[PDB]
Amino acid sequence: TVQRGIIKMVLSGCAIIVRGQPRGGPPPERQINLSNIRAGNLARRAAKDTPDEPWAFPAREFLRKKLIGKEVCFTIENKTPQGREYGMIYLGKDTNGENIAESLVAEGLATRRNNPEQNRLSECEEQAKAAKKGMWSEGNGSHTIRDLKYTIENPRHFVDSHHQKPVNAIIEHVRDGSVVRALLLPDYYLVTVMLSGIKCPTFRTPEPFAAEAKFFTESRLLQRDVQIILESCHNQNILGTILHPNGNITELLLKEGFARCVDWSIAVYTRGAEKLRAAERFAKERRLRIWRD
Ligand SMILES: COc1ccc(Cl)cc1S(=O)(=O)Nc1cccn2nc(C)nc12
């Protein structure tokens, strides 16, 4: 039964989260775990820190550059008693386009856990192995394990150190419409980035337009490559501004009635405090969302 969606995100082990379109509330999300294949677990924390396995980040990044935002179709081969769905995703509008699992195994960024589907995966794995790609390269793959830091040591120094020069980063999670979790590169600091000069509504049951603000920002920036101006800090959080070619998310959120200009932190906004007050004034005059009567 061929189903359809957009890629919301790609996870640890290249299980992919697929979403639909919303119809009164945020979109329905499904987490598909790729059938017949195995990729590494990414780094994670619990009792202790545990690092990236070999080749897990490069696998995640491969499907991320390739898939995020695109329209896929999928098919659910099984549903386990643990509450998980296994299946195959095809990057296109049909079950004969580009099987994403075949891309992984040909790059050597995954492996197999007879029939046409299983034959195609073999043909990919033999090629990858016979061209020394990914995990079939000479070595242990230690150069693919990120030196992942969960906290910045001296934050004021760290921000002062970059002199407001944008830092390439990946936006890994959206807590609410105005605070994100940003993977900074090339040092692999995973940290909390609050948008300088604004505040969206927030999750506790949630304030009006929190879920809407979260979605607005999340569908535009989750698992996208961005640059961040690190402007100041609040505790172990980075006050900053996000750059992307399509626009300024801070300037939009206010302009679209999803945010209010907060007085303290707007002093550190480098891109120009007049524009944030202007876009709020745009929303307020138009009676948009948080400004309705
Ligand atoms: C992946 O895309 C994005 C990344 C970052 C930002 Cl800040 C915006 C976008 S966007 O092009 O998707 N949206 C929009 C762009 C411009 C104006 N509007 N107005 C509405 C209502 N949306 C947009």
mmCIF file of C-alpha atoms and ligand atoms in Angstrom:
data_model
loop_
_atom_site.group_PDB
_atom_site.id
_atom_site.type_symbol
_atom_site.label_atom_id
_atom_site.label_comp_id
_atom_site.label_asym_id
_atom_site.label_seq_id
_atom_site.Cartn_x
_atom_site.Cartn_y
_atom_site.Cartn_z
ATOM 1 C CA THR A 1 0.000 0.000 0.000
ATOM 2 C CA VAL A 2 2.048 2.975 -1.314
ATOM 3 C CA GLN A 3 1.880 5.898 1.179
ATOM 4 C CA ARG A 4 3.306 9.439 0.832
ATOM 5 C CA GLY A 5 4.880 12.234 2.873
ATOM 6 C CA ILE A 6 7.639 14.783 3.430
ATOM 7 C CA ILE A 7 10.885 13.989 5.284
ATOM 8 C CA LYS A 8 10.732 15.750 8.651
ATOM 9 C CA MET A 9 14.026 14.287 9.829
ATOM 10 C CA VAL A 10 16.533 11.431 9.711
ATOM 11 C CA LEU A 11 17.579 9.818 13.020
ATOM 12 C CA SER A 12 20.213 7.620 14.631
ATOM 13 C CA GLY A 13 20.570 4.449 12.496
ATOM 14 C CA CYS A 14 18.825 6.168 9.584
ATOM 15 C CA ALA A 15 15.323 5.450 10.823
ATOM 16 C CA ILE A 16 13.522 8.380 9.158
ATOM 17 C CA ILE A 17 10.685 10.511 10.548
ATOM 18 C CA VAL A 18 8.118 11.234 7.783
ATOM 19 C CA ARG A 19 5.266 13.728 8.155
ATOM 20 C CA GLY A 20 2.130 14.643 6.247
ATOM 21 C CA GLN A 21 0.354 17.980 5.994
ATOM 22 C CA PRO A 22 -1.567 19.403 8.950
ATOM 23 C CA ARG A 23 -5.381 19.425 9.133
ATOM 24 C CA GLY A 24 -6.380 21.181 12.388
ATOM 25 C CA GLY A 25 -3.260 20.710 14.552
ATOM 26 C CA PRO A 26 0.368 19.906 13.635
ATOM 27 C CA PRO A 27 1.013 17.161 10.981
ATOM 28 C CA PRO A 28 0.779 13.385 11.651
ATOM 29 C CA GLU A 29 4.345 11.967 12.159
ATOM 30 C CA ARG A 30 5.512 8.432 11.384
ATOM 31 C CA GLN A 31 8.985 6.989 12.231
ATOM 32 C CA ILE A 32 10.026 4.442 9.601
ATOM 33 C CA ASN A 33 12.996 2.172 10.397
ATOM 34 C CA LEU A 34 14.628 1.023 7.139
ATOM 35 C CA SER A 35 13.888 -2.653 6.488
ATOM 36 C CA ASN A 36 16.685 -5.126 5.712
ATOM 37 C CA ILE A 37 19.545 -2.713 6.625
ATOM 38 C CA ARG A 38 21.761 -1.611 9.529
ATOM 39 C CA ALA A 39 23.442 1.729 10.185
ATOM 40 C CA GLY A 40 25.371 2.875 13.231
ATOM 41 C CA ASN A 41 23.930 4.521 16.307
ATOM 42 C CA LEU A 42 24.904 8.166 16.751
ATOM 43 C CA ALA A 43 26.312 9.568 19.992
ATOM 44 C CA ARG A 44 24.006 9.834 23.015
ATOM 45 C CA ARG A 45 23.865 10.480 26.715
ATOM 46 C CA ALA A 46 22.296 8.736 29.703
ATOM 47 C CA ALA A 47 24.161 7.268 32.744
ATOM 48 C CA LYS A 48 27.312 8.010 30.808
ATOM 49 C CA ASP A 49 28.207 9.645 27.456
ATOM 50 C CA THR A 50 28.536 7.077 24.640
ATOM 51 C CA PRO A 51 30.201 8.146 21.356
ATOM 52 C CA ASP A 52 29.331 7.799 17.667
ATOM 53 C CA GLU A 53 29.962 4.340 16.249
ATOM 54 C CA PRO A 54 32.072 4.205 13.087
ATOM 55 C CA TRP A 55 30.229 5.566 10.024
ATOM 56 C CA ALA A 56 26.962 6.568 11.807
ATOM 57 C CA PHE A 57 27.274 10.361 11.410
ATOM 58 C CA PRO A 58 28.386 10.135 7.767
ATOM 59 C CA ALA A 59 25.333 7.892 7.128
ATOM 60 C CA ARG A 60 22.961 10.355 8.876
ATOM 61 C CA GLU A 61 24.511 13.248 6.953
ATOM 62 C CA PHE A 62 24.228 11.389 3.609
ATOM 63 C CA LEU A 63 20.460 10.926 3.854
ATOM 64 C CA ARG A 64 20.084 14.390 5.492
ATOM 65 C CA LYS A 65 21.684 16.476 2.648
ATOM 66 C CA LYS A 66 19.858 14.250 0.192
ATOM 67 C CA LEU A 67 16.354 13.853 1.692
ATOM 68 C CA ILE A 68 15.362 16.701 4.085
ATOM 69 C CA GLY A 69 12.367 18.643 2.780
ATOM 70 C CA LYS A 70 11.870 16.362 -0.264
ATOM 71 C CA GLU A 71 8.668 14.440 -0.995
ATOM 72 C CA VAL A 72 9.027 10.666 -0.510
ATOM 73 C CA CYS A 73 6.793 7.635 -0.733
ATOM 74 C CA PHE A 74 7.033 4.621 1.618
ATOM 75 C CA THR A 75 5.766 1.063 2.306
ATOM 76 C CA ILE A 76 5.451 -0.598 5.747
ATOM 77 C CA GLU A 77 6.644 -4.252 5.558
ATOM 78 C CA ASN A 78 5.996 -5.023 9.267
ATOM 79 C CA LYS A 79 4.836 -3.615 12.612
ATOM 80 C CA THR A 80 6.549 -5.114 15.700
ATOM 81 C CA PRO A 81 5.172 -5.635 19.251
ATOM 82 C CA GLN A 82 7.643 -2.938 20.500
ATOM 83 C CA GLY A 83 5.577 -0.269 18.574
ATOM 84 C CA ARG A 84 7.970 0.275 15.632
ATOM 85 C CA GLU A 85 7.422 0.312 11.888
ATOM 86 C CA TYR A 86 9.845 -1.164 9.353
ATOM 87 C CA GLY A 87 9.725 -0.296 5.665
ATOM 88 C CA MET A 88 11.341 1.103 2.541
ATOM 89 C CA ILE A 89 11.405 4.758 1.455
ATOM 90 C CA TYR A 90 11.673 5.872 -2.173
ATOM 91 C CA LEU A 91 12.736 9.457 -2.913
ATOM 92 C CA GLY A 92 10.019 10.332 -5.430
ATOM 93 C CA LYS A 93 6.316 9.723 -6.179
ATOM 94 C CA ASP A 94 6.435 5.917 -6.722
ATOM 95 C CA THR A 95 7.760 2.557 -5.472
ATOM 96 C CA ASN A 96 10.185 2.311 -8.460
ATOM 97 C CA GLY A 97 12.145 5.576 -7.898
ATOM 98 C CA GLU A 98 15.298 5.865 -5.735
ATOM 99 C CA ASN A 99 15.212 3.321 -2.838
ATOM 100 C CA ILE A 100 17.153 5.208 -0.127
ATOM 101 C CA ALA A 101 18.479 1.996 1.468
ATOM 102 C CA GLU A 102 20.197 1.114 -1.801
ATOM 103 C CA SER A 103 21.940 4.524 -1.717
ATOM 104 C CA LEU A 104 23.252 3.850 1.849
ATOM 105 C CA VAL A 105 24.666 0.406 1.193
ATOM 106 C CA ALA A 106 26.350 1.483 -2.086
ATOM 107 C CA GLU A 107 28.107 4.329 -0.210
ATOM 108 C CA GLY A 108 29.124 1.752 2.409
ATOM 109 C CA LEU A 109 27.214 3.801 4.955
ATOM 110 C CA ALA A 110 25.044 0.799 5.883
ATOM 111 C CA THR A 111 24.832 -3.019 5.577
ATOM 112 C CA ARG A 112 22.345 -5.886 5.184
ATOM 113 C CA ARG A 113 20.852 -7.281 8.404
ATOM 114 C CA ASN A 114 16.126 -14.714 -2.120
ATOM 115 C CA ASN A 115 14.199 -12.122 -4.124
ATOM 116 C CA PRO A 116 14.531 -9.002 -6.417
ATOM 117 C CA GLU A 117 14.575 -6.496 -3.520
ATOM 118 C CA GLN A 118 17.201 -8.534 -1.648
ATOM 119 C CA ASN A 119 19.213 -9.097 -4.842
ATOM 120 C CA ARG A 120 19.400 -5.288 -5.490
ATOM 121 C CA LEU A 121 20.778 -4.678 -1.965
ATOM 122 C CA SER A 122 23.449 -7.350 -2.529
ATOM 123 C CA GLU A 123 24.505 -5.791 -5.872
ATOM 124 C CA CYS A 124 24.925 -2.497 -3.985
ATOM 125 C CA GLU A 125 26.949 -4.035 -1.123
ATOM 126 C CA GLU A 126 29.317 -5.912 -3.494
ATOM 127 C CA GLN A 127 29.953 -2.685 -5.460
ATOM 128 C CA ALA A 128 30.621 -0.632 -2.306
ATOM 129 C CA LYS A 129 32.969 -3.312 -0.958
ATOM 130 C CA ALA A 130 34.731 -3.662 -4.373
ATOM 131 C CA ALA A 131 35.272 0.156 -4.536
ATOM 132 C CA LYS A 132 36.470 0.659 -0.923
ATOM 133 C CA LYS A 133 33.657 3.037 0.190
ATOM 134 C CA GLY A 134 32.616 3.837 3.764
ATOM 135 C CA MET A 135 32.995 1.012 6.286
ATOM 136 C CA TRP A 136 34.751 -1.037 3.531
ATOM 137 C CA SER A 137 37.724 1.404 3.546
ATOM 138 C CA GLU A 138 41.107 0.368 4.958
ATOM 139 C CA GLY A 139 40.829 1.259 8.649
ATOM 140 C CA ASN A 140 38.718 1.340 11.798
ATOM 141 C CA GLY A 141 36.736 4.465 10.809
ATOM 142 C CA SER A 142 37.790 6.376 13.960
ATOM 143 C CA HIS A 143 37.957 9.612 11.852
ATOM 144 C CA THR A 144 34.111 9.421 11.520
ATOM 145 C CA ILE A 145 33.529 9.510 15.310
ATOM 146 C CA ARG A 146 32.697 13.129 16.202
ATOM 147 C CA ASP A 147 34.475 14.700 19.186
ATOM 148 C CA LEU A 148 31.042 15.649 20.478
ATOM 149 C CA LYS A 149 30.924 18.286 23.217
ATOM 150 C CA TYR A 150 27.643 18.761 25.075
ATOM 151 C CA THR A 151 28.732 21.896 26.951
ATOM 152 C CA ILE A 152 30.886 24.931 26.020
ATOM 153 C CA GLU A 153 33.552 25.361 28.692
ATOM 154 C CA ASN A 154 33.943 29.160 28.950
ATOM 155 C CA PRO A 155 30.898 30.480 27.052
ATOM 156 C CA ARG A 156 31.610 34.262 27.096
ATOM 157 C CA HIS A 157 35.101 33.524 25.770
ATOM 158 C CA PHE A 158 33.711 31.081 23.173
ATOM 159 C CA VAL A 159 31.295 33.731 21.770
ATOM 160 C CA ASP A 160 33.928 36.525 22.045
ATOM 161 C CA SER A 161 36.267 34.107 20.182
ATOM 162 C CA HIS A 162 34.192 34.079 16.983
ATOM 163 C CA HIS A 163 33.837 37.928 16.779
ATOM 164 C CA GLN A 164 30.248 37.677 15.334
ATOM 165 C CA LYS A 165 31.518 35.733 12.281
ATOM 166 C CA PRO A 166 28.934 33.160 11.225
ATOM 167 C CA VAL A 167 29.573 29.560 12.248
ATOM 168 C CA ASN A 168 28.314 26.750 10.016
ATOM 169 C CA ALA A 169 25.861 24.612 11.951
ATOM 170 C CA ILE A 170 23.051 22.084 11.740
ATOM 171 C CA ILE A 171 19.779 22.642 13.589
ATOM 172 C CA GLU A 172 19.115 19.313 15.347
ATOM 173 C CA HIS A 173 15.867 19.999 17.332
ATOM 174 C CA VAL A 174 13.268 22.761 17.797
ATOM 175 C CA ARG A 175 12.194 23.127 21.508
ATOM 176 C CA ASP A 176 9.894 26.030 20.630
ATOM 177 C CA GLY A 177 9.702 28.507 17.712
ATOM 178 C CA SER A 178 12.504 30.672 19.160
ATOM 179 C CA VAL A 179 14.924 28.223 20.885
ATOM 180 C CA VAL A 180 16.709 25.439 18.939
ATOM 181 C CA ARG A 181 19.495 22.900 19.535
ATOM 182 C CA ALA A 182 22.339 23.679 17.133
ATOM 183 C CA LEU A 183 25.198 21.329 16.130
ATOM 184 C CA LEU A 184 28.032 23.843 15.626
ATOM 185 C CA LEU A 185 30.806 22.923 13.136
ATOM 186 C CA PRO A 186 33.597 21.986 12.754
ATOM 187 C CA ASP A 187 34.091 21.514 16.584
ATOM 188 C CA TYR A 188 30.885 19.431 17.165
ATOM 189 C CA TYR A 189 29.484 21.435 20.054
ATOM 190 C CA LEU A 190 25.838 20.419 20.565
ATOM 191 C CA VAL A 191 24.222 23.436 22.221
ATOM 192 C CA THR A 192 21.058 25.397 22.865
ATOM 193 C CA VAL A 193 20.594 28.502 20.675
ATOM 194 C CA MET A 194 17.994 31.134 21.669
ATOM 195 C CA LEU A 195 17.085 33.646 18.909
ATOM 196 C CA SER A 196 18.405 37.083 19.979
ATOM 197 C CA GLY A 197 15.783 39.738 20.604
ATOM 198 C CA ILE A 198 12.603 37.554 20.525
ATOM 199 C CA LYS A 199 10.404 35.114 22.443
ATOM 200 C CA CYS A 200 7.822 32.752 20.986
ATOM 201 C CA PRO A 201 5.022 31.299 23.046
ATOM 202 C CA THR A 202 6.167 28.285 25.081
ATOM 203 C CA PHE A 203 5.408 24.719 26.149
ATOM 204 C CA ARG A 204 4.591 23.913 29.760
ATOM 205 C CA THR A 205 -0.135 22.821 28.704
ATOM 206 C CA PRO A 206 1.141 25.266 26.059
ATOM 207 C CA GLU A 207 0.590 28.997 25.579
ATOM 208 C CA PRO A 208 -1.465 30.086 22.535
ATOM 209 C CA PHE A 209 0.555 29.609 19.268
ATOM 210 C CA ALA A 210 3.452 27.684 20.828
ATOM 211 C CA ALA A 211 2.793 24.607 18.716
ATOM 212 C CA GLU A 212 2.241 26.874 15.701
ATOM 213 C CA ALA A 213 5.468 28.851 16.406
ATOM 214 C CA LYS A 214 7.351 25.570 16.918
ATOM 215 C CA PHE A 215 6.090 24.252 13.548
ATOM 216 C CA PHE A 216 6.783 27.479 11.665
ATOM 217 C CA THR A 217 10.474 27.402 12.637
ATOM 218 C CA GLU A 218 10.788 23.580 12.604
ATOM 219 C CA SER A 219 9.502 22.982 9.022
ATOM 220 C CA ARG A 220 11.900 25.682 7.746
ATOM 221 C CA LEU A 221 15.127 24.846 9.732
ATOM 222 C CA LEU A 222 15.111 21.343 11.351
ATOM 223 C CA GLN A 223 18.084 19.322 9.964
ATOM 224 C CA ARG A 224 19.115 22.108 7.638
ATOM 225 C CA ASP A 225 22.616 23.502 7.171
ATOM 226 C CA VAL A 226 22.731 27.032 8.551
ATOM 227 C CA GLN A 227 25.105 29.643 9.829
ATOM 228 C CA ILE A 228 24.708 31.198 13.280
ATOM 229 C CA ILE A 229 25.969 34.561 14.510
ATOM 230 C CA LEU A 230 26.793 33.883 18.169
ATOM 231 C CA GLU A 231 25.852 37.201 19.733
ATOM 232 C CA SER A 232 25.863 36.673 23.527
ATOM 233 C CA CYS A 233 24.972 33.970 26.099
ATOM 234 C CA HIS A 234 22.372 33.296 28.806
ATOM 235 C CA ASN A 235 23.683 30.635 31.209
ATOM 236 C CA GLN A 236 24.524 27.495 29.141
ATOM 237 C CA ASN A 237 22.452 28.873 26.214
ATOM 238 C CA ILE A 238 23.735 30.795 23.191
ATOM 239 C CA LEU A 239 21.967 34.022 22.230
ATOM 240 C CA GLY A 240 22.275 34.210 18.450
ATOM 241 C CA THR A 241 20.799 34.702 15.004
ATOM 242 C CA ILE A 242 20.247 32.103 12.237
ATOM 243 C CA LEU A 243 21.257 32.714 8.637
ATOM 244 C CA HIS A 244 19.733 30.740 5.748
ATOM 245 C CA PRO A 245 19.384 31.801 2.060
ATOM 246 C CA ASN A 246 15.535 31.761 2.179
ATOM 247 C CA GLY A 247 15.416 34.473 4.924
ATOM 248 C CA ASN A 248 15.843 35.543 8.564
ATOM 249 C CA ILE A 249 13.672 33.306 10.790
ATOM 250 C CA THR A 250 13.762 35.960 13.573
ATOM 251 C CA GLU A 251 12.506 38.688 11.191
ATOM 252 C CA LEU A 252 9.814 36.325 9.822
ATOM 253 C CA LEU A 253 8.465 34.988 13.188
ATOM 254 C CA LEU A 254 7.759 38.558 14.337
ATOM 255 C CA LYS A 255 6.478 39.623 10.849
ATOM 256 C CA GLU A 256 4.037 36.649 10.806
ATOM 257 C CA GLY A 257 2.702 37.213 14.370
ATOM 258 C CA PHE A 258 4.495 34.253 16.078
ATOM 259 C CA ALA A 259 6.842 36.306 18.346
ATOM 260 C CA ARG A 260 7.243 39.434 20.560
ATOM 261 C CA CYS A 261 10.396 41.566 20.805
ATOM 262 C CA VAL A 262 11.921 41.053 24.297
ATOM 263 C CA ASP A 263 13.721 44.134 25.631
ATOM 264 C CA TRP A 264 16.846 42.701 27.326
ATOM 265 C CA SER A 265 18.216 40.431 24.583
ATOM 266 C CA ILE A 266 17.492 42.668 21.580
ATOM 267 C CA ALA A 267 20.608 44.701 22.555
ATOM 268 C CA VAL A 268 22.794 41.798 21.273
ATOM 269 C CA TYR A 269 20.997 41.406 17.887
ATOM 270 C CA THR A 270 23.690 42.323 15.328
ATOM 271 C CA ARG A 271 21.572 42.343 12.146
ATOM 272 C CA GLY A 272 19.787 45.597 13.228
ATOM 273 C CA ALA A 273 17.304 46.116 16.099
ATOM 274 C CA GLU A 274 15.125 48.506 13.992
ATOM 275 C CA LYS A 275 14.037 45.655 11.726
ATOM 276 C CA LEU A 276 12.713 43.446 14.609
ATOM 277 C CA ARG A 277 10.630 46.288 16.063
ATOM 278 C CA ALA A 278 9.373 47.061 12.518
ATOM 279 C CA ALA A 279 8.226 43.469 11.821
ATOM 280 C CA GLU A 280 6.482 43.275 15.211
ATOM 281 C CA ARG A 281 4.775 46.584 14.355
ATOM 282 C CA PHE A 282 3.794 44.910 11.038
ATOM 283 C CA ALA A 283 2.112 42.005 12.858
ATOM 284 C CA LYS A 284 0.515 44.196 15.577
ATOM 285 C CA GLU A 285 -1.113 46.601 13.089
ATOM 286 C CA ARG A 286 -2.463 43.655 11.005
ATOM 287 C CA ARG A 287 -4.029 41.857 14.068
ATOM 288 C CA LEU A 288 -2.044 38.629 13.338
ATOM 289 C CA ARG A 289 -2.144 35.538 15.618
ATOM 290 C CA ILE A 290 -0.686 36.675 18.981
ATOM 291 C CA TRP A 291 -2.103 40.191 18.234
ATOM 292 C CA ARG A 292 -5.747 39.223 17.544
ATOM 293 C CA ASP A 293 -8.384 40.852 19.744
HETATM 294 C C1 LIG B 1 13.561 26.280 4.074
HETATM 295 O O1 LIG B 1 12.958 27.581 4.015
HETATM 296 C C2 LIG B 1 13.108 28.643 4.864
HETATM 297 C C3 LIG B 1 14.217 28.785 5.692
HETATM 298 C C4 LIG B 1 14.354 29.874 6.538
HETATM 299 C C5 LIG B 1 13.388 30.867 6.560
HETATM 300 CL CL1 LIG B 1 13.651 32.203 7.626
HETATM 301 C C6 LIG B 1 12.268 30.748 5.720
HETATM 302 C C7 LIG B 1 12.124 29.631 4.874
HETATM 303 S S1 LIG B 1 10.751 29.432 3.795
HETATM 304 O O2 LIG B 1 11.025 29.837 2.436
HETATM 305 O O3 LIG B 1 10.361 28.053 3.810
HETATM 306 N N1 LIG B 1 9.511 30.388 4.208
HETATM 307 C C8 LIG B 1 9.342 31.784 3.965
HETATM 308 C C9 LIG B 1 10.301 32.606 3.393
HETATM 309 C C10 LIG B 1 10.038 33.958 3.204
HETATM 310 C C11 LIG B 1 8.820 34.503 3.563
HETATM 311 N N2 LIG B 1 7.898 33.697 4.107
HETATM 312 N N3 LIG B 1 6.734 33.996 4.509
HETATM 313 C C12 LIG B 1 6.204 32.853 4.991
HETATM 314 C C13 LIG B 1 4.838 32.685 5.586
HETATM 315 N N4 LIG B 1 7.075 31.836 4.888
HETATM 316 C C14 LIG B 1 8.142 32.399 4.317
#
